[PDB]
Every structure is written in structure tokens, then in C-alpha cells.
């Protein structure tokens, strides 16, 4: 055994007395003395002695000794001697059922801590020992063992459900179920809590005893103890997700039970009971089994959506829980509205009409929340009531209480689509005017709500925002001086969404003069590796696309930062590929948006981006991105490639020899987005290159013909394929000519549905040069070529002559009598168009 030294022990007791000193200036001096002894082993051997052996000391003094020992395990267990731990673990299990509730708790937290920091495999004699303490005749020993077992089950769930401890769950789980019928409520609650840890994981030991579990759950249904109710509720909620089949026959009994528990006195029990409705609603059998309970369920949920008296104080002046009865009831009501749709209206409509116009703001606020929660589902049914509710809600935007104002913003944004469909002078105009007011609200929460609601309204209004663009920009710009932290990020979203809505209408000198200077300021002040950079990155990306040529005086610092982010991202990518454990993995999202912004500048600024391209390694980095394993990265790279090809090919041309083999291997139709941009890339390159395109053709030509022939291919992909093929045959027809008969069918089938733009023009210029070389392939399928040529409404005069020569060359080859019967299968507009526009 081990015996302590009295003199050393006396100073340890002194250290415990100094730790209990009320003065704050003394507590810091003793912690430094303990920190030195903490590193010293054998010191912990003294602490465990004071806790258990030394019973001549105060209960808080002994307990403090055991709790200091706990903190040493949480930090220095990697250095704990094997001789010491064996004594501590032996001393704890001998006092696991101490008479003193304070001592029993201290021993309890020690045992679970050793099994937490130190792995369970290092203490194999713990589990079978604890189970043997459950059958103990002593009560406190039983409780102490269960209290420890529950914490172990909570900490290490996956460990117990593995071959690490030789499957200890096959003994404990059947053992726990036998304690559901125990006398003490603390023991009964302990048992349920342990089993619940293995419901979702579908533990074999529990799944084969599922019938014994459910039967024992129903036995505890009418239990008065809240802690027991809570775990039973948690049990049924989990069981509802994994074993629906075994609950279905008893479903109606459960629903009536949960309905009473949702209305329970203790909010903790009600919250766990409320989770049932949220999980049940996402089941394909809900609509049938719950329809008989809807009249009773709806008012329960609505009543639970009110702010509690405790919540109101915490909000005035996040500061509240991330999840409570309010949010849970509201979430359940939302999904329920999506299940029954309009069938939920007779149960909610009469409730709303009392809530929305109630005098108590707390009651009124809840009604507004309800009205927004059922918006998505009961949309088509709320229509007749919207002409009354919407103007009322707009009035509620100027309510005295802030919590009423903020929720009204959200609820209004839920019905944003209907507002836009109506005449803008009736609903849209006052809504927009009042929202802009609430953006500059004094209350921070209302600011967030209004700015979020306005952003939602922008996606629905789109071009309807133009007549208000002057007022909108004034409000948003001014918000920069007020908005900080969480309020600032939402503001970027409101600005970016605006740019994606008004489009080129934003491009005006007075608008740019207000919007850009505060944006560039934030663009420079913000450091890298910041969580405020990304929302601004997406913001400017939208603005650059909208402003187009107006972004030129501000493109310099934006271009450089984007190139830097791409380079920095590729840097961390290499470090993570070589030493994954030592270096953090990079976030590709910052690089993808950066590439998209660069692609936006290349397209928006055109040839004015030429100088910035040469003074940077944008093409070198681009070469690396095209080889990345992530599809989204390769997609945004090829897009940037094609844009720079049109912007400034004189800087791109040197790197064509290396880009082409990459583009040729990325023509995989598996990745639609990547394949499309790649196909479009080589097309734009083919134009700038010219006759110099010949050595790169045979490695991509066979690829394109394959793609344009494969069935179930998306419309946009077939278009860009046909356009590219035609573009290849325009500069170098000789290599594409013999393939003409192979792709002549889907080429005309696809490009007959597109408008007469530049892409179509260059494509048809290529199909004419190839026909002039190989007129053979077009003969067999000439009916498709005629339909494709007739698709042209206003072709260029030189392109018209090309069409005319081919048509006349064909008519003078087969004869007139062979041309009439050939044109008898032509539709009415097809035959008349060719006969007049081309005179054939």
C-alpha cells in the first residue's frame, strides 16, 4: 500500500484552505504553487488520499482535493505513472457509493474523467465491475455506478459499439433494460438515458431486443418524474427515425401521449416532446396517421411559438439559446404546412385572425411568426387573405416594439413573390419604402431582419427595382456607417443581389460614385484569412458583372487580390498534399469565386484588362487550377481561359501548346459543367489561332463528335459542342471535312433553336467552308441543313451568299423535278423562306 507524510500533508491542507479563500488576490498565488506540484508525480497520490481516506476534514475540503486531481488528469494524464493511476482507480471504485452526496459526485466525476482522457481500453476492468455494482444491495452504490455508466455511454458511443472492447454492449444493453422497472426514479432515468445512446446507431444488442425496449417504454409512459418523461420522449423520437415499423401499430397511442408532453409544465420535457412532431412530419406516413390529430396539434404548436417571459428580457438590450420550444414549434408548423398544404388552413386561419390583431404585442408577434411559417406550404390558399394581411403587415413595420418590427420583415419576405405579381403601386411601393426605413433602424436585430428581407425581395422584383434604384443605393451606402459585425455581412448580400437584379441599369456615374468608394475601402482594410472577405468577394463579383465598363477605375486592387488568393490557395494545397498532418487543408471556395471574379473582369472590361494580365502570373496559376481534382475548380478555370482568349489572346497564345492537351482530356461528359466550359474554350481559341490550330485538332475533334452523338445530353452542352465544331472547321476545314457526315444530323438539330448571334454566325461560316470542301456528307442529310439555314432570320450578306451557293449548287445538281418532291416534305414556313430569301 501507500502511506502519506504528515508534514507534507499539512501544507496540502493549507493549499486547500488557500483555494477556499474568499479574497481574489490570494487565489492566484496558490494556483502557481499547485501548478508546480501538478507537474510533480506522486502529488496526485496525496490528493486521492484526502478525498477518500482522510475523513477528519471538511466535506468541501475533501471534494476540492478530488476535483483538483480531476484537472490534473485532464492535462497531465499523458505523463501519469502506472503505479499511481492503479491506486487512484482502486480508491475510486471503493468509494463510488459514498454516503455523502458531495463526495459521491466527486468520485463519480473522477471515474468518468479517467475513462474519458485515458481510453477505455486502458481500463478494461471498469465496465464489468460497474455492471456488478448495479446489482449491489446498497442503494448509493447502485446510483453511483449508473451515474458513471451513463456518462461513459455519452462520452464514448462509437467506442462501445466496436470490436475495441470485445463488444461490451451485448451485456450492458440487455442489463440496462432490466432496470426500467426499478423503484427509484433516478435509477430508472439513468437506465433509459443509457439505452438511448444506442438507438440511432442501430446497435445490434438493442435492435434484436427492440420489442423488450418498446414494451418497457410504454410501461414508463405514466411516470410523474420529469427527468423520466424527458428520456422516454427522447427514446420515442429516436425510435421514430430508425424503427418506424415497430412503432406503427401503436402510433395513435404515442401521438396522444406526445401531445400531452408537448404541453408539459417543464419546458425541458416539452421541448424534447416537440421534436417528435418535427421528425414525424418528415415521414411518408405522416399525412395519414396525423390527420386525425391536426385539430388538436395545431393550437399546441401555435401556443408554444410565443416568446416566454424569460426570453423577452434576454433579447431587449446571440443572447438566447440556439434552439428552444419556440423555434421547434415553428419549424414543425412549417413542414406540416408543406405536407397538408391548404388542408391546414381551417385550423390556422381562425387562430391568426385573433393573433394578428391582438393588443398584447407578445401575442401579436407570435401570430405574425405563424403567418410566415405557413407561407411556403399554404401559399395558394393564403391568396384571398393577402390583400388584407399585407397592408396590415406594412403597418406593423412601424410598431413600437422592436421584436414586432423584426419578425414582420421576415414574414413579409415570405410573401415577396405575390407582392411582385401585383401592381407595384399597391403593395410593392409601400413595402419597399418601409423596408428601407427599417434598414436604418436603431435596433440591431431589426436592421438584420430588414436587410435580409430586402435582399429576398430583390430576387423577386429584379427589374422592378429600377425606378427605386436611386433611393435604394442611398439607403444601402449610408448603412456602412451604422452596420458592424453581423449587420455588415448581410449588407453585402443586399448590395450584390441588387446588382444581379438591376443588371446594367446600375452602370451610371452617380451610382458608381456612391457605391464603389466604400466598397474599395472595405476591400483594402480587411486582412486575408478573414470571414468577412468572402461575402465581399461575391459582392464585388456581382457588381463587376453589372457595372461592366464602369468597374474600370476600380479594377486594379480587385484584380491583384484575386490573383493572390488563387496563388495562396494553391500554396496551402501543396503543403497539405505533402504533409497533411502538419499543414491545414485549403478552402477551394475562396479560389473558385476569385476565378469567377477574374472571369467577370475579363468579360466586362474586355481589352482594358490587358495590362494587368501581363504584369501577373494569372496564366501560370490558371494552368495549375485546370489540373485540380475538384470539378468546380476546373470549371471556373476554363471559363477564365475563354474570356482571356477574347480579351487579350496575345498573352494567352504562348501558353496554348500546354493548355490544349489539358482541354482535350477534360472533354468528359460526366462532368457537364466542366465539359461545357472546356468545349466553349477550344472554340474561342480556334478563332484567335486561325490556321495555326491544325496540330491541336486531332486530339479534340474525335472527342467532340463523340459528345454530340451521345443521347440524353443536355441542350446547352449540345449547342456549345456544335458551335465549337463549326469554329474548328472554319479556320482549318481540311481536318474536320471528312467528319462532316458523322455530325451533320445533331449539328443542325441543335443550332436551329438558337438565336442569330455571333456564336451561331461563326458556326455556320464553318459549316459552309466544310461543305465547299466535302459536299458529299451533306447530301444524305440535306433536309436538316435546309431547316438550319431557314432558322436564320437576319444573316450577314456574305453569309447569305454562302447559303445561296450551296442551295443553288444542290438544285442544279439533282434537277428541278427532284427538288420539288424533295421540298414537298417541308413545312409551310420552311419552303416559303427558302424560295424567297435565297431564291431556290
Amino acid at each position: 500500500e501507500w502511506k502519506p507524510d504528515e508534514q507534507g500533508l499539512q501544507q496540502i491542507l493549507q493549499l486547500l484552505k488557500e483555494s477556499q479563500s474568499p479574497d481574489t488576490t490570494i487565489q492566484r498565488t496558490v494556483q502557481q504553487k499547485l501548478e508546480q506540484l501538478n507537474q510533480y508525480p506522486d502529488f496526485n497520490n496525496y490528493l486521492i488520499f484526502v478525498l477518500t481516506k482522510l475523513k477528519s476534514e471538511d466535506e468541501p475540503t475533501r471534494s476540492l482535493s478530488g476535483l483538483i486531481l480531476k484537472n490534473n488528469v485532464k492535462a497531465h494524464f499523458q505523463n501519469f505513472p502506472n503505479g499511481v493511476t492503479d491506486f487512484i482507480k482502486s480508491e475510486c471504485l471503493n468509494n463510488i457509493g459514498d454516503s455523502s452526496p458531495l463526495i459521491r459526485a466527486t468520485v463519480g466525476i473522477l471515474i468518468t474523467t479517467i475513462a474519458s482522457k485515458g481510453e477505455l481500453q486502458n481500463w478494461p476492468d471498469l465496465l464489468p465491475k460497474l455492471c456488478s455494482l448495479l446489482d449491489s444491495e446498497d442503494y448509493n452504490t447502485c446510483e453511483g455506478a449508473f451515474g458513471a455508466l451513463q456518462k461513459i455511454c455519452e462520452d464514448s458511443a462509437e467506442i462501445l459499439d466496436s470490436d475495441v472492447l470485445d463488444r461490451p454492449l451485448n451485456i450492458m444493453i440487455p442489463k440496462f433494460l432490466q432496470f426500467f422497472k426499478h423503484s427509484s426514479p433516478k435509477i430508472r432515468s439513468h437506465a433509459v438515458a443509457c439505452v438511448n445512446q444506442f438507438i440511432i446507431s442501430r446497435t445490434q444488442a438493442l435492435m434484436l431486443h427492440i420489442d423488450s425496449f418498446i414494451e418497457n417504454l410504454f410501461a414508463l409512459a405514466g411516470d410523474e418524474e420529469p427527468e423520466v418523461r424527458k428520456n422516454v420522449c427522447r427514446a420515442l423520437v429516436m425510435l421514430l427515425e430508425v424503427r418506424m415499423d415497430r412503432l406503427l401499430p401503436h402510433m395513435h397511442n404515442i401521438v396522444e401521449y406526445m401531445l400531452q408532453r408537448t404541453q408539459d409544465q417543464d419546458e425541458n420535457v416539452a421541448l424534447e416532446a416537440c421534436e417528435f412532431w418535427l421528425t414525424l412530419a418528415e415521414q411518408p406516413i405522416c399525412k395519414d396517421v396525423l390527420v386525425r390529430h391536426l385539430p388538436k396539434l395545431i393550437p399546441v404548436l401555435v401556443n408554444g411559438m410565443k416568446y416566454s417571459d424569460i426570453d423577452i428580457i434576454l433579447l431587449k438590450g446571440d443572447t438566447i439559446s440556439d434552439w428552444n420550444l419556440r423555434k421547434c414549434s415553428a419549424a414543425a408548423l412549417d413542414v406540416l404546412a408543406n405536407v397538408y398544404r391548404d388542408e391546414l388552413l381551417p385550423h390556422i386561419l381562425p387562430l391568426l385572425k385573433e393573433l394578428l390583431f391582438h393588443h398584447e404585442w407578445v401575442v401579436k408577434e407570435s401570430g405574425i411568426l405563424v403567418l410566415g411559417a405557413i407561407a411556403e406550404g399554404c401559399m395558394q390558399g393564403m391568396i384571398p387573405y393577402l390583400p388584407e394581411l399585407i397592408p396590415h403587415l406594412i403597418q406593423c413595420l412601424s410598431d413600437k416594439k422592436a421584436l414586432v418590427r423584426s419578425i414582420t420583415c421576415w414574414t413579409l419576405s415570405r410573401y415577396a413573390h405575390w407582392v411582385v405579381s401585383q401592381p407595384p403601386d399597391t403593395y410593392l411601393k409601400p413595402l419597399m419604402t418601409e423596408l428601407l426605413k427599417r434598414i436604418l433602424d436603431s435596433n440591431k436585430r431589426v436592421q438584420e431582419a430588414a436587410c435580409s428581407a430586402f435582399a429576398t425581395l430583390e430576387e423577386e422584383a429584379c427589374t422592378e427595382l429600377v425606378p427605386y434604384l436611386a433611393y435604394i443605393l442611398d439607403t444601402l451606402v449610408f448603412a456602412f456607417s451604422k452596420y458592424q459585425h453581423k449587420n455588415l455581412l448581410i449588407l453585402y448580400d443586399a448590395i450584390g443581389t441588387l446588382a444581379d437584379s438591376v443588371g446594367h441599369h446600375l452602370n451610371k456615374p452617380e451610382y458608381i460614385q456612391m457605391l464603389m468608394p466604400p466598397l474599395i475601402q472595405k476591400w483594402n482594410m480587411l486582412k486575408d484569412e478573414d470571414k468577412d472577405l468572402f461575402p465581399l468577394l461575391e459582392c464585388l463579383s456581382s457588381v463587376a458583372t453589372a457595372l461592366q465598363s464602369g468597374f474600370l477605375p476600380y479594377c486594379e486592387p480587385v484584380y491583384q487580390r484575386c490573383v493572390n488568393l488563387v496563388q495562396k490557395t494553391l500554396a496551402q494545397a501543396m503543403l497539405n498534399n505533402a504533409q497533411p498532418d502538419q499543414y491545414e487543408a485549403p478552402d477551394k471556395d475562396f479560389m473558385i469565386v476569385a476565378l469567377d471574379l477574374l472571369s467577370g473582369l475579363a468579360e466586362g472590361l474586355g481589352g482594358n484588362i490587358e495590362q494587368l494580365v501581363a504584369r501577373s502570373n494569372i496564366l501560370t496559376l490558371m494552368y495549375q487550377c485546370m489540373q485540380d481534382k475538384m470539378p468546380e475548380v476546373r470549371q471556373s478555370s476554363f471559363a477564365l481561359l475563354g474570356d482571356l482568349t477574347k480579351a487579350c489572346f496575345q498573352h494567352v497564345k504562348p501558353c496554348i501548346a500546354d493548355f490544349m492537351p489539358i482541354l482535350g482530356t477534360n472533354l468528359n461528359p460526366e462532368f457537364i459543367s466542366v465539359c461545357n466550359n472546356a468545349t466553349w474554350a477550344i472554340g474561342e481559341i480556334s478563332i484567335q489561332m486561325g490556321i495555326e490550330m491544325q496540330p491541336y485538332i486531332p486530339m479534340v475533334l474525335h472527342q467532340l463528335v463523340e459528345i454530340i452523338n451521345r443521347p440524353n445530353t443536355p441542350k446547352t452542352l449540345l449547342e456549345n459542342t456544335a458551335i465549337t465544331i463549326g469554329r474548328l472547321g472554319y479556320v482549318c476545314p481540311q481536318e474536320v471535312a471528312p467528319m462532316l457526315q458523322q455530325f451533320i444530323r445533331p449539328w443542325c438539330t441543335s443550332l436551329r433553336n438558337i438565336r442569330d448571334n455571333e456564336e451561331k454566325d461563326s458556326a455556320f461560316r464553318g459549316i459552309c467552308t466544310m461543305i465547299s470542301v466535302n459536299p458529299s456528307g451533306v447530301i444524305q442529310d440535306f433536309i436538316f441543313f435546309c431547316d438550319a439555314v431557314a432558322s436564320w432570320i437576319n444573316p450577314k450578306d456574305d453569309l447569305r451568299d454562302m447559303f445561296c451557293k450551296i442551295l443553288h449548287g444542290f438544285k442544279n445538281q439533282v434537277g428541278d423535278e427532284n427538288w420539288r418532291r424533295f421540298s414537298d416534305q417541308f413545312p409551310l414556313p420552311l419552303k416559303e423562306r427558302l424560295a424567297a430569301f435565297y431564291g431556290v
Binding site: K327, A330, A331, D334, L369, G372, I407, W410, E448, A449, S452, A455, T456, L489, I490, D493, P535
Partner: peptide, 7 residues
């Protein structure tokens, strides 16, 4: 989540 929800 970029836009605040009461849920």
C-alpha cells in the same frame, strides 16, 4: 446561412 431566420 447568410440571411437570418426566426427558426
Amino acid at each position: 446561412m447568410l440571411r437570418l431566420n426566426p427558426y
